[PDB]
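Quick one from the shared queue. A colleague (R.T.) flagged Putative periplasmic binding transport protein as missing a structural entry in our internal table.

Convert sequence to structure tokens.
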Amino acid sequence: APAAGSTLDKIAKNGVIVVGHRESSVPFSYYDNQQKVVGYSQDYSNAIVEAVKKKLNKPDLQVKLIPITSQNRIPLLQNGTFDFECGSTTNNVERQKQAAFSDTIFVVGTRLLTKKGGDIKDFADLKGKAVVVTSGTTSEVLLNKLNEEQKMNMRIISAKDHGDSFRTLESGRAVAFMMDDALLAGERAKAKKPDNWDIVGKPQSQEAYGCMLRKDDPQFKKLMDDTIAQVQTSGEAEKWFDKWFKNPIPPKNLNMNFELSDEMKALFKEPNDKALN
Ligand SMILES: N[C@@H](CCC(=O)O)C(=O)O
């Protein structure tokens, strides 16, 4: 039975499960402009919600969706503003000190989005340039460290969410947008002129996405991991990948045209929660 102070206990006592979600993490957790929060990662959230309803024997359990940001996700998680979220949050050692993560659901490389006809081809070209990044992300940490350690004299602009960062680039307020490659492609898919943007540069890091939940809650993590494991090992995860990464997706019916890496296929065979950092 759920111990006091655990998430399942909180949900049962409050009579509702609070699902944190993203507004601009395409195509993981975002608004489809059809009144729904959708995406590859959100699909796991829905599966986890179903598992919770079953586990607690509450078929009519309330489900409340609350938007979160890269910057406020941990503080909101810690005071229980939301119970868990599946989106584009990187699982790393530092964050494990403040939260817990489910088995890995995606892997990304941190790169740059910039104009095709522009002069930015790699990270070295960013010296003395204006670069935008989303507040509270691993890319912001990496970019600031690179700026300091390599004395790049970059003017770093920190935006509230990925769409804001992209629009900063699109409107000429920055020459490049540094972020997880999948997210860069996601913002490009919503651009006024998608073809005008290229993802370039050597990845500054390889990062694993995991649904995030509160730390020291083994029972809720188990429920989430068990749900993820069945989705991945059954072949359902790949079907979700194809839907969100190989077919037209909202809100502009564009295609990500991504391919599932052999590494991801290996993980789907045997799910695990190892932080890549
Ligand atoms: N995955 C990175 C950037 C993307 C995001 O935060 O939504 C992070 O967790 O910081």
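Residues 40-55 form the longest helix (16 residues).
The two ends are 34 Å apart (CA to CA).
Added to the table.
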